[PDB]
Design a protein around this ligand. Structure first.
Ligand SMILES: CS(=O)(=O)Nc1ccc(-c2cccc(C(=O)O)c2)cc1
Length: 242
């Protein structure tokens, strides 16, 4: 069921980094990773939490649809793309934390906790501040656990409406061409050691789906582009994308 392929480590070491890629072949129900241990180590989800957060916000009516505009609060932040109005699509695209912090406040601790348990999401522990627990609270999730959650979302099996799941998968759209579609979400965890980057999602092919979840050491923001680059090198090596 699970196979370890340490040859992928070359893709990390060549960039003087360390991390894990986890792949799941949906048709064959087989998983692949370069590091079985790290594949099952639990990290802060950081902005990958915008997937479950979006689902919950939509299903509870906190977010009406993917067109609703969340006005900039007028507080100048250091990420320029955050200092503007957003909808669900652009808020996902630019990882607009303050928009999702307000979602969490409106969801509230009780419903957030109840929903993460229904999702079987990570350690399901929202201890910490309701508007930041996915950044510096007690919640943790592994790369293999990200896959399990994403597979439920792909199949509309999470305990929210089909509509909520379709909208979030639309908002997860990252890349599409004649060969594949990638739906995914990046993450960047800095408040609790070790600092890491995430990229989780899936690759849709004509006749199969490959789920993926990777995290990697991220001592500075200079390496953030390696999250996608390393994942794609693994995908290319396994002949999943040209
Ligand atoms: C480059 S910089 O401007 O020096 N600092 C900086 C840049 C980007 C981010 C960020 C925030 C949320 C999510 C993500 C993500 O990639 O998923 C990235 C944080 C700090």
């Amino acid at each position: 069921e699970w196979q370890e392929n340490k040859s992928w480590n070359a893709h990390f070491t060549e960039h003087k980094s360390q991390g894990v890629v986890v792949l799941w072949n949906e048709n064959k129900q087989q998983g692949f990773t370069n590091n079985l241990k790290r594949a099952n180590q639990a990290f802060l989800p950081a902005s990958t939490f915008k997937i479950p957060n979006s689902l919950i916000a939509l299903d509870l009516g906190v977010v009406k649809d993917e067109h609703q505009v969340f006005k900039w609060d007028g507080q100048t932040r250091d990420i320029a793309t955050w200092n503007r109005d957003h909808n669900l699509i652009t808020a996902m695209k630019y990882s607009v934390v303050p928009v999702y912090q307000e979602f969490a406040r409106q969801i509230g601790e009780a419903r957030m906790s109840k929903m993460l348990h229904a999702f079987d999401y990570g350690n399901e522990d929202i201890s910490g501040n309701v508007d930041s627990f996915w950044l510096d609270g007690g919640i943790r999730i592994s790369a293999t656990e990200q896959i399990s959650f994403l597979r439920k979302l792909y199949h509309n099996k999470l305990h929210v409406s089909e509509r909520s799941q379709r909208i979030v998968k639309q908002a997860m759209l990252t890349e599409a061409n004649g060969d594949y579609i990638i739906r995914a979400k990046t993450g960047y965890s800095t408040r609790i050691e070790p600092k890491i980057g995430w990229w989780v999602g899936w690759v849709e092919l004509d006749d199969n789906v490959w789920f993926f979840a990777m995290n990697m050491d991220m001592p500075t923001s200079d390496g953030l582009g390696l999250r996608q680059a390393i994942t794609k090198e693994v995908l290319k090596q396994e002949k999943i994308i040209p």
